[PDB]
Amino acid sequence: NNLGTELDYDTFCFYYDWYGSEAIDGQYRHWAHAIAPDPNGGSGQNPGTIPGTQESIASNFYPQLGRYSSSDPNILTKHMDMFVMARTGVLALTWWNEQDETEAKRIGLILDAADKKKIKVCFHLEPYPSRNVQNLRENIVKLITRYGNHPAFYRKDGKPLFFIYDSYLIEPSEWEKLLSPGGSITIRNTAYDALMIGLWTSSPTVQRPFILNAHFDGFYTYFAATGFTYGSTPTNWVSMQKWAKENGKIFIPSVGPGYIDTRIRPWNGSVIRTRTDGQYYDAMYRKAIEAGVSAISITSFNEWHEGSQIEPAVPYTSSEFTYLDYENREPDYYLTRTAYWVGKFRESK
Ligand SMILES: OC[C@H]1CNC[C@@H](O[C@H]2O[C@H](CO)[C@@H](O)[C@H](O)[C@@H]2O)[C@@H]1O
Numbered sequence: 001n002n003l004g005t006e007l008d009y010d011t012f013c014f015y016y017d018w019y020g021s022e023a024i025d026g027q028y029r030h031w032a033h034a035i036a037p038d039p040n041g042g043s044g045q046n047p048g049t050i051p052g053t054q055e056s057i058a059s060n061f062y063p064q065l066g067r068y069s070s071s072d073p074n075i076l077t078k079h080m081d082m083f084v085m086a087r088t089g090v091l092a093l094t095w096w097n098e099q100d101e102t103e104a105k106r107i108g109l110i111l112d113a114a115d116k117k118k119i120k121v122c123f124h125l126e127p128y129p130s131r132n133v134q135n136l137r138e139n140i141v142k143l144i145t146r147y148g149n150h151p152a153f154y155r156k157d158g159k160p161l162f163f164i165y166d167s168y169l170i171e172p173s174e175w176e177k178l179l180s181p182g183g184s185i186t187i188r189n190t191a192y193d194a195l196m197i198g199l200w201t202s203s204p205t206v207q208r209p210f211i212l213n214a215h216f217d218g219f220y221t222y223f224a225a226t227g228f229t230y231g232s233t234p235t236n237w238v239s240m241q242k243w244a245k246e247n248g249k250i251f252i253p254s255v256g257p258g259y260i261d262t263r264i265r266p267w268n269g270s271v272i273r274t275r276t277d278g279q280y281y282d283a284m285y286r287k288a289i290e291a292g293v294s295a296i297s298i299t300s301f302n303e304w305h306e307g308s309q310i311e312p313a314v315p316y317t318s319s320e321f322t323y324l325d326y327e328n329r330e331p332d333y334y335l336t337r338t339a340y341w342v343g344k345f346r347e348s349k
Pocket of ligand 1: 094124126127165303305306
């Protein structure tokens with residue numbers, strides 16, 4: 001078929017499975033959330049928590065699907081249909097090394113639900129405690145071993161792909177051991193080889209040798225808020241793509257529809273980026289496509305705490321809070337607008 005509705009398998013959408021309900025999970029997990037203290041504020045801060053009640057959840061927006069459980073099969077079905085609507089072929093799943101049965105259950109349910117809709121799943125390896133190249137290798141082995149035969153397990157030209165959040169917290173001399181073909185614990189040329197995509201944060205002076213010395217296969221930028229880092233400043237993307245091409249690296253810029261996290265980080269107002277009826281999303285996606293990249297990542301499907309979600313949101317006013325919503329756009333606007341941009345990306349790919 002050539003209908004302009006097919007999934008794009010070089011479009012990665014960051015997905016969070018950490019939401020719970022009392023009924024399914026024992027608590028309204030993540031809908032309830034600690035309010036972060038101001039890093040530059042008082043020492044006697046008692047910031048408190050967002051309770052995760054119907055009236056007060058840990059987001060400046062409100063989900064169309066309500067306080068959902070990420071463990072709910074019928075929620076997962078609806079999410080996969082939303083991915084199909086958005087034409088986002090790859091779900092990039094947050095992964096925290098929780099080593100707990102409830103997470104194992106969610107990962108299998110997600111894989112299964114994804115496959116029914118021909119969606120692929122890769123892992124977004126988060127900064128778990130004492131994360132280091134050795135336990136990273138052990139975890140990569142476990143993930144490939146356990147899920148590598150699942151039909152929804154993502155591969156690019158035969159290789160799995162991982163995004164590594166806050167990769168800069170690990171020295172390139174450690175990365176080399178895992179990622180150089182000559183490294184003492186290398187995955188190169190093994191059954192566990194993978195495209196490893198590190199987080200480009202700051203200036204090229206720092207990031208270029210980091211990426212090269214660490215032997216990452218590519219880089220992404222994550223942050224939905226333009227200007228937050230050098231990497232998340234879209235006017236740098238043409239130059240970043242040029243460098244990537246010259247150095248055999250895969251650049252996967254991250255685009256998002258907006259940013260606001262002030263429910264959980266009330267001191268963080270300067271990082272707010274307004275949606276302006278979709279214009280912000282359009283401007284950022286336009287810049288990625290114009291940089292001539294081979295792949296694009298979307299921040300995010302459902303990071304509700306940070307207001308970067310494309311998942312449908314609805315107007316809601318409670319006695320506790322008046323939520324933001326999609327203004328003059330329908331709840332599914334960001335899904336259908338994503339499909340539009342995917343079309344434009346494919347057109348110039
Ligand atoms: O997935 C990458 C990155 C995206 N932003 C949130 C990061 O997780 C932190 O912040 C969450 C609230 O937004 C919080 O619930 C997590 O525990 C973590 O502090 C995530 O690593």
